[PDB]
């Protein structure tokens, strides 16, 4: 029943600003959303370096407790290695965390939900949606 | 033939007195486990509690800092 | 995880399945209403109350008996 | 959340706070609420300390209320494996460490937990282990 | 189907000497034997301090792979605390590892299989057997 | 009525040619997983392989060293 | 875990259940007889053979492309 | 046995041994057979290095034969949590560490594994982490 994988940019976008349009998109697709553990790494890092780590970790816990967190396994690392090579043949620069997140979704046949679709635009074999 | 006697299946419930009872429109409810607590929401309104509260400090993730 | 609400005795009751069940330590929870949402937490587990609560006798663990 | 745990309390710090209830540990308890745990090895020492006391009925009640606010982890195979390595690492160096403290250290090193202890000088002889003194 | 818990002394006795009488006792009771993780701690320690750690860890792996290893949980620690108090009211000295092993078996209703029964003799509420 | 078509349940097997085949007396067999390997023994003779080999050095656990 | 031996095609075969099953990497195992016991291990996984086996091309990972 | 693992190989040491096949690492591989592993983060870098090479068909075959003799662990929630703490611990000190190496260090600290690395000077800036140089 898993269908969407939320990238890091859409999580920061949602946690900081709490948009109304995202709230209705979450309530309708509840039970079919997830994030890669790479995104969990970035969220935890942001809380630990902030000025109120315990308060911010509490908000992350309520966010994480409503979705699934997928482990970055051998298949995800395999697709990420192929994508990094596919991107090298062109002049397309992509961030290392975003590369791993994209290959993770492709290894599971999931749709990337993101904040700005133009950075996942150049990867072949995966679908993206803009929930901004 | 020969069969067995058993007891029906139970489960752990919480009671809501009338001062904190849920409205009549909700017959199905979503439950979420946050640490030691649990959150009881209507079926299609699971995120409303997390959106209307649970604020983060203004400096949280102002810079993603991805190399 | 979606459940269902029923009625038992004179009051309302929410059905907590196995995956989100409470430990057997908990038989008393405090419930707070936030809009259409009800939040349940185990009762009486605040550190400020325990530090001021019942104290331990004067002889308890005056000698930790770890060999060596 | 089981992935929210960060600190493991040794037996020394537990006895210190239960007997004296100091304000300094009271502050650090409130700050790191929900992120503390002890090993079942520590739970064994506490339960034994109450059963042999002059008032076991009321001392057990205090301890159970103390355990009710933290998690108790089982001493599993990984904790036993790291304790075995640690006991050999210490025999090569002639550094004496008590048996219960040896099992507590191996239990925390097996899962990357920071040891909160009253006597940091005894645990600092263990390789690959972080300690903090909350006294 | 679990019935017996092997103490540390019987394991050292069996691994070092490999007795014939123990081999037939093991083959008949296969699938009903186990050890506490406290005993696994002592076995691993003995291999790591020996002169051939990798070879000795290999022999332990084959031994462990044929039985179950039980975690020392809250119930086991509870019975161990009671036994330590029960032993303190007398003049009965018992080793710390043997105390934890005894309380672990009592918390699970298991029979202690040991090398010399006279050290588990003074604990109340558990049965012992001598497989020497 | 209406039912379904399915495939019978399979499982992963290893073949033993005649040069390493087991005797005829063994119709039931115990399998044990040791790391990456697996050990195939007769039903009531599961420990014979571990007893006749797998020797430890003479210094192993000469002193238990329990405090 | 006790299983049962059967016959498939012209030879004998041992029945490996799910709990002690082999990964899908393994389709070829070496079997050695010790008395009444047969020991199976995956084939061709000796380090001394891999260090002397096929080598990697001269350009492989001449530049690890870790950003920063 | 999953509880027999002790060492985790970083990406640097893997490239070093695959390209050169040195005798010193060959010895330590034979000694610690069955007790070595890598993170899926390292597997990603290796697979990418073969796919972009002049002979991806035969380089992938060599890597898969290399992985066939060690275990590959998934980068789970605990590994992600320790990496987050490590990145904040390093920002407080101005110590630069690469992103893939940061995830490798957090993955090993989450389960108490010893890091085998070619460049110990980069990993020694991480708190509560043991390293060894097998070069």
**Half-sphere exposure of residue E65: CA atoms within 13 angstroms, side-chain side:** 26
Contact with chain E for residue D88, Cβ under 8 A: yes
> What count of CB pairs under 8 Å joins A to H?
90
Torsion angle of C-alpha atoms E4, E7, E12, E13, degrees rounded to 10: -60
Tokens standing for B59?
A: 């400096």
Residue among A54, A61, A64 minimizing CB distance to D31: A54
- E65–H1: do the CB atoms touch at under 8 Å? yes
B13-16 and C11-15 strand pairing: antiparallel
G37-42 and F37-42 strand pairing: antiparallel
DSSP for H34-64, written as a single string: TSEEEEHHHHHHHHHHHHTSS-HHHHHHHHH
Neighbour subunits, D (≥3 Cβ pairs < 8 A): A, B, C, E, H
Domain count, chain A: 1
| Shortest CA distance from A95: residue in chain G | G67
Cβ within 8 Å of A, H 2-61: 40-41, 43-48, 50-52
Say which residues have a Cβ less than 8 Å from residue H31's Cβ, sequence separation at least 6: E54
The neighbouring-strand residues paired with B33 are B38
| Shortest CA distance from A38: residue in chain B | B66
DSSP for H91-128, written as a single string: HTTT----HHHHHHHHHHHTTTPEEE-S-HHHHTTSTT
Residue among E72, E80, E97 minimizing CB distance to D74: E72
Tokens standing for H55?
A: 């002979």
| Shortest CA distance from D35: residue in chain B | B35
Q: Left if phi > 0, otherwise alpha if psi is -120 to 50, otherwise beta: which for D10?
A: beta
D93-106 burial code (b ≥16 CB/10 A, e <16): eeeebbbbbbbbbb
Q: Give the structural domain span for B8.
A: 1-67
Element holding D116 (H helix, E strand): strand D114-116
- Phi, psi of A111, deg, nearest 5: -95, 130
Contact with chain C for residue B43, Cβ under 8 A: yes
Distance CA E30, CA E8 (A): 18
Which of D129, D117, A38 is CA-nearest to residue H109? D129
Which of A103, A132, A128 is CA-nearest to residue A117? A128
Tell me which method was used to determine the 3D structure: X-ray
| Shortest CA distance from D30: residue in chain A | A54
Give the minimum alpha-carbon distance from A125 to chain B in angstroms, rounded to a whole number: 24
Element holding H13 (H helix, E strand): helix H11-20
Domain count, chain G: 1
């Amino acid at each position: 029943m898993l269908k969407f994988m939320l990238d890091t940019n859409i999580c920061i976008f949602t946690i900081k600003n709490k948009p109304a349009s995202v709230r209705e998109r979450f309530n309708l697709n509840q039970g079919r959303m997830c994030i890669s553990s790479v995104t969990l790494m970035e969220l935890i890092y942001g809380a630990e370096k902030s000025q109120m780590p315990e308060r911010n970790l509490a908000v992350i816990e309520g966010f994480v407790s409503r979705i699934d967190v997928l482990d970055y396994d051998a298949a995800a690392a395999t697709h990420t290695g192929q994508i990094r090579a596919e991107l090298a043949r062109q002049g397309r620069p992509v961030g290392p965390f975003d590369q791993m997140i994209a290959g993770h979704a492709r290894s599971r046949g999931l749709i990337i939900v993101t904040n700005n679709t133009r950075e996942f635009e150049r990867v072949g074999g995966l679908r993206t949606e803009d929930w901004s | 033939m020969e069969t067995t006697v058993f007891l029906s299946n139970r489960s752990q419930a919480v009671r809501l007195p009338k001062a904190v009872a849920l409205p009549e429109n909700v017959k199905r409810v979503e439950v979420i486990a946050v640490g030691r607590t649990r959150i009881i929401t209507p079926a299609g309104e699971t995120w409303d509690e997390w959106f209307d509260g649970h604020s983060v400090s203004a400096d949280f993730m102002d810079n993603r800092e991805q190399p």
